């Protein structure tokens, strides 16, 4: 068995959607990310109010690719005033640190049966950027990602 995730109460988990494969590669290389304004605001609030008591995990997926590509942990608050134009599109304002945990492709077929009660019971694989995942569903997703091969 594997009960690593039992009794974990502090932890928050979000979907990250990237239109760009390039941005994924740059995030893996330099351990940084940036979301939309409302996306950054959601993550910064969860990171700050967690106050080191647990992790904020990020489940990355390239829109249209049909698979999740990895897991990272958020490792800083959002700096909203940073160099512009470092990503594929000039849409994103700011930067925060991440630490990538898993880089592996996990087909949506492995995850589509987990549904998010906070998003109209939709499959977790039909989420938008910074969709938050309830902790109990997030544990199921993480166990799947870690044990896929
Ligand atoms: C640099 N961050 C990003 N890159 C590409 N796409 C994104 C991003 N955030 C949200 N979406 C949809
Ligand atoms: Cl999106
Ligand atoms: Cl939204
Ligand atoms: Cl929850």
Half-sphere exposure of 97 (CA within 13 A, CB side): 4
Neighbours of 146 (CB within 10 A): 16
CA dist 10 and 127 (Å) reads 22
State the structure-solving technique.
Answer: X-ray
Could you tell me which residues are annotated as the binding site for RNA? 17-19, 23, 33-34, 63, 87, 92
Six-digit token string for 54:
């647990």
State the residue range of the domain holding 58: 1-149
CA dist 118 and 88 (Å) reads 31
Written in H, E and C, the secondary structure of the chain is CCCCCCCCCCCEEEEEEECCHHHHHHHHHHCEECCCHHHHHHHHHHHHHHCCCCCEEEEEEECCCCEEEEEEEECCCCECCCCCCCCCCCCCCCEEEEEEEEEEEEEHHHCCCCEECCCCCEEHHHCCCCCEECHHHHHHHHHHHHHCC
- Contact yes or no for 9/73 (Cβ under 8 A): no
Per the structure, the count of domains in the chain is 1
**Which residue owns the Cα nearest ligand 1 atom 1?**
34
**Could you tell me if the CB of 60 is within 6 A of ligand 1?**
no
Q: Which ligand is nearest to the CA of 35?
A: 1
CA angle 23, 16, 61 (to 5 degrees): 70
What is the resolution of the experimental data for this entry, in Å?
1.8
- Contact yes or no for 61/69 (Cβ under 8 A): yes
CA dist 56 and 40 (Å) reads 13
**Could you tell me if the CB of 132 is within 6 A of ligand 1?**
no
> Residue 136 Cα, ligand 2 centroid: separation in angstroms?
23
**Could you tell me if the CB of 47 is within 6 A of ligand 1?**
no
**Could you tell me if the CB of 61 is within 6 A of ligand 1?**
no
| Residues composing the chain | 149
**Which residue owns the Cα nearest ligand 1 atom 7?**
18
- Contact yes or no for 94/47 (Cβ under 8 A): no
């Amino acid at each position: 068995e594997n009960l690593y995730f039992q009794h974990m109460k502090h932890g928050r988990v979000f979907i990250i959607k990237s239109y760009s494969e390039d941005d994924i590669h740059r995030s893996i290389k330099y351990n940084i990310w940036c979301s939309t304004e409302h996306g950054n605001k959601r993550l910064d609030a969860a990171y700050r109010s967690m106050n080191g008591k647990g992790p904020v995990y990020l489940l990355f997926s390239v829109n249209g690719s049909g698979h999740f590509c990895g897991v990272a942990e958020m490792k800083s608050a959002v700096d909203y005033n940073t160099c512009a134009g470092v990503w594929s599109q000039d849409k994103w304002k700011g930067r925060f640190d991440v630490r990538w945990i898993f880089v592996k492709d996990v087909p949506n077929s492995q995850l589509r049966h987990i549904r998010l009660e906070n998003n109209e019971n939709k499959p977790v694989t039909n989420s938008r950027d910074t969709q938050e995942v309830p902790l109990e569903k997030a544990k199921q997703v993480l166990k799947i990602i870690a044990s896929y091969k």
